[PDB]
Structures are given as C-alpha cells and as structure tokens.
Amino acid sequence: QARQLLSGIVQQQNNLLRAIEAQQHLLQLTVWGIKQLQARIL
Amino acid sequence: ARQLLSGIVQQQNNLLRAIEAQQHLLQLTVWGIKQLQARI
C-alpha cells in the first residue's frame, strides 16, 4: 500500500529531475541565441 | 506515517506545476529570440 506510493514518488522525483535537466539544456540554447543577437547588434 | 507522504505528494504537485510554468516561460523566450532574429 504505502510501498506503492513510496515507489511512485521516487519515480516522480526522477521524472521532475530529468525535466529540469532538459529545461536547463533548453535554457542554455536560449542564452546562445541572446548572445548571438547581441553580437549582431554590436 | 502517511501524514508526511501526503505532504510530499502535494509538494510534488507544486514542483511539477513550477516546471510547467517555467516551460511556458521558456517557450515565450524562444518566441522572442525567433522574432528578433528574423527581423535582423
């Protein structure tokens, strides 16, 4: 009973962590673009 | 006991919804980059 909830929470935490990692990669792309546009203006 | 698993599951919700709100914020910043990049 509580071993199913405890197992799904650890499963959930790895899901959230992998989402954060992907979002961090997506954000580092965002930073490249901004620097690339800044360089073009300068 | 299940008092604390209940508080954790709720916390998972807020974290998940934060991930989702930040994702909309990320897509919005992509949109701005694509608009500024195309104009120049």
Partner: peptide, 29 residues
C-alpha cells in the same frame, strides 16, 4: 541558427513528454 531551431524543438519535445509522464505519475500518487 537552423541547428539551433533543431535542438530547440528537440528538447521541447523531450520536455513535453517528461511533463506528460509526470502528470500521469502525479495522478497515481
């Protein structure tokens, strides 16, 4: 810039799926 557009939608897909897996898993708990 086109590889940029490529990696953008690549990770956007990757995230949207993880957000999907997470909501369904949240619904379980």
């Amino acid at each position: 810039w086109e590889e940029w557009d490529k990696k953008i939608e690549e990770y956007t897909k990757k995230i949207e799926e993880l957000i999907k897996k997470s909501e369904e898993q949240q619904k379980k708990n």
